[model samples]
Target chain A: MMYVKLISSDGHEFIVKREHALTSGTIKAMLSNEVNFREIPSHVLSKVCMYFTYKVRYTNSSTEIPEFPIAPEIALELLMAANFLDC
Target chain B: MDVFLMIRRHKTTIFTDAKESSTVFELKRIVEGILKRPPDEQRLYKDDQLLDDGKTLGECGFTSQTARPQAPATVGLAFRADDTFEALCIEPFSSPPELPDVMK
Candidate 1:
């Protein structure tokens, strides 16, 4: 599986699957150039946003999962992060 | 973070005199009333997908909440002069799909 390291706005670091990262079109586009590379600079996502991304990534891989709702605040945060990461 | 978009497609009656414009929350309530079910239990959709609750109508490009704009003015809204109205609502969410294989 492909992997990418994401650095949150507050400096938290997360290593996520490439497929999971691709959920955001912005990241998918960026991954095209860095498929062989493993790290990415995510300077705009807050710590909460990173946590939420992780939730989506993990839940998406699980067999039984609860419905995940995107709160308005979180949506805006991810939008900002996606734009900043250029993913 | 997750994001959702609400989409709605409805056919208006040509001869109806009633006029109404609704917010997402209000629409949810109306659907609940019509279906005789709780709002939380009824999943609303447009096209074939569920709408995201996170984004406002404005974010979905419907209207500007800041401006408190009114709905568009159109006379004699109708699907077809001969047919009853049909409405479809679709909500898009940042949440991953229910099935794994699709995304995987």
Candidate 2:
């Protein structure tokens, strides 16, 4: 029921659960201070969000070390996004 | 699969262009020459298997996948990672901050 709303640079909205969103250090920092919002670059945020959830599920609860498969082109950007969100 | 290179060094990942002509040694040059890392010192791994020098990406069935569209093959590079920092460099403060702007 509770959520944090994240906006991407191009103006798209994502409503993710507060616990889930807390995994992002930047998001966690802002939300902890009651800031609750803002934009990151294109396409990266959503992928980061999925990774946050993935980390939540498999990093502890399961043994399936599924590759977070992405096209090779996005590989560079994904790492950049990971750095951007380093929590 | 054009492997997108994730040439990592102590939290740094340098992206190398995907090339069919590129050999593992040349890849190491980017390490030795550019990053200044000795290939002999670091361990390179992809998905679990270690990478060998004589083999080209094409030899391993990798093609240009990215850093561009229809250009370099991508996935091929994603599998590789080198974790050798025994030869990594350090940068000390050039001039530990105080007053440079207002110094008389």
Candidate 3:
């Protein structure tokens, strides 16, 4: 039931579950009390966290899993975030 | 697997995971869990349109029109002020704050 506070570059706060957050390799590597990704915007960070939720939910699913959605406008930004987080 | 909801209350923004089938009331319950506010005291909206508690999010128009839209749809939240209901005052979306030189 552990939770972590993620502060985006804009100072927006995102409360995320620890187990769901560990899905990100970079986050797992950092392993800190709190994380502030100065380069990641709120929208991008939120999207990444959303993807983490998706991954955690269906990682071990026996049934068919649905595809995670991504917006075309932030496609490159999201990919950079994906690369940065290494999720 | 899940949809992201960006619920804005004044200057604070809450991001929570929800299924597409989640009801507006269910979303209020989630907000209640986080904000410690009861469902009856809070009102949820999409733009200026008041969201119906009985309706699911999909029925509220969160569909995959052009594939899955990854961005979380912004939903406005307003709490009643005393006995009267106040306007939902969500500010315009702004860019990220500038980082300090040491951090940058």
What is the lDDT of every predicted structure here? 0.35, 0.49, 0.73
| Of 2 and 3, the candidate ranking higher by lDDT | 3
State which candidate, 1 or 3, has the greater lDDT. Answer: 3
Per lDDT, the best of the predicted structures is 3
The sequence of per-residue lDDT tens digits that candidate 3 reaches over residues B2-61 is: 566678866566656677788999989888887788899999998899999999888887
iRMSD, per candidate, in listed order: 20.9, 17.0, 5.5
List the lowest-lDDT window of 10 residues for candidate 2 chain B.
B69-78
User: Model 2 residue B52 lDDT?
Assistant: 83
- Write model 3 residue lDDT over A1-87, tens digit each, in one string: 366777777776777777877888798788755788898877678778778766766678896677887655556677888888887
Model 2 CAPRI quality = incorrect
Q: Please report how far candidate 3 places residue A75 from its true position, in Å.
A: 6.0
Sort every candidate by lDDT, greatest first.
3, 2, 1
Candidate 1 DockQ score? 0.02
Top DockQ model: 3
> Which 10-residue span in candidate 3 chain A carries the lowest summed lDDT?
A69-78
* TM-scores of chain B alone in all candidate structures, in the order given: 0.32, 0.52, 0.80
What's the DockQ for every one of the candidates?
0.02, 0.02, 0.20
lDDT of 1 at B14: 10
